Design a protein around this motif. Structure first.
Motif, PDB file in Angstrom:
ATOM      1  N   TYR A  59      33.603  41.314  41.222  1.00  0.00           N
ATOM      2  CA  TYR A  59      32.930  41.351  39.734  1.00  0.00           C
ATOM      3  C   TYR A  59      33.715  41.193  38.538  1.00  0.00           C
ATOM      4  O   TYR A  59      35.081  41.297  38.834  1.00  0.00           O
ATOM      5  CB  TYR A  59      32.212  42.900  39.878  1.00  0.00           C
ATOM      6  CG  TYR A  59      31.029  42.818  40.824  1.00  0.00           C
ATOM      7  CD1 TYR A  59      29.940  42.440  40.600  1.00  0.00           C
ATOM      8  CD2 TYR A  59      31.574  43.209  42.334  1.00  0.00           C
ATOM      9  CE1 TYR A  59      29.043  42.404  41.553  1.00  0.00           C
ATOM     10  CE2 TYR A  59      30.431  42.986  43.245  1.00  0.00           C
ATOM     11  CZ  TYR A  59      29.201  42.605  42.830  1.00  0.00           C
ATOM     12  OH  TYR A  59      28.176  42.291  43.884  1.00  0.00           O
TER      13      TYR A  59
ATOM     14  N   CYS B 258      23.058  40.031  37.910  1.00  0.00           N
ATOM     15  CA  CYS B 258      22.645  40.749  39.391  1.00  0.00           C
ATOM     16  C   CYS B 258      21.339  40.769  39.867  1.00  0.00           C
ATOM     17  O   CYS B 258      20.093  40.500  39.098  1.00  0.00           O
ATOM     18  CB  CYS B 258      22.908  42.459  38.775  1.00  0.00           C
ATOM     19  SG  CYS B 258      24.419  42.679  38.224  1.00  0.00           S
TER      20      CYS B 258
ATOM     21  N   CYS C 174      25.884  45.784  41.956  1.00  0.00           N
ATOM     22  CA  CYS C 174      26.113  44.904  41.013  1.00  0.00           C
ATOM     23  C   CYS C 174      26.316  45.260  39.480  1.00  0.00           C
ATOM     24  O   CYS C 174      27.121  45.149  38.915  1.00  0.00           O
ATOM     25  CB  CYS C 174      25.342  43.380  41.164  1.00  0.00           C
ATOM     26  SG  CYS C 174      25.749  42.334  39.910  1.00  0.00           S
TER      27      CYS C 174
END
Lengths: 56, 56, 56, 56
Positions: free
Chosen positions: A11, A16, A35
């Motif tokens: 990340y 997402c 996410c």
């Protein structure tokens, strides 16, 4: 020491999934998925961490 | 910290495999695999974690 | 315990990608990616760990 | 809490790679790689954990 964990290495990601798999952050806010949680972790520079999996 | 962990960040899931490969929870219950365990962790909202790998 | 972690179990490695995606070590040094970080952790023999994701 | 971790979920495995990527266990023994470490963790039923990555 044994833990249950999240790896946020991949990340941030600009987009997402809309999958709802809630994570509760140490800001006591509930992130809709890994996410969103991880994007927020990396941008928080240190100040946001995991409280537990699931809704706060 | 250096830990031994299970990654539960993609949980919950719709169903788990029938694969036997036990994990012992902090509730001293043996979960038939990682998937069954993590589905339980994410509902436990904070209270269930890893005890060790393999049967309790 | 619920943690935020990096998995360094397949380290050390022969080389790392040039990919920028920083991790801040417990030494307050910023490691250009997870691979560079974990190659350093595995040499640190205990003393280096994760501080947070992203640049220090 | 931020950690550096090993996931031993896929283990045990009856055969391991001959790759030398040492892990130091809490028994203060050095396991030649993740696979040897994890086989041993799962069989130890709780009593073996991670000390740090690298040779003890």
């Amino acid at each position: 020491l044994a833990a249950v964990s999240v790896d946020c290495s991949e990340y941030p990601k600009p987009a997402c999934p809309k999958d709802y798999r809630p994570v509760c952050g140490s800001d006591n806010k509930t992130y809709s998925n890994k996410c969103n949680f991880c994007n927020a972790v990396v941008e928080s520079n240190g100040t946001l961490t995991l409280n537990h999996f699931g809704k706060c």
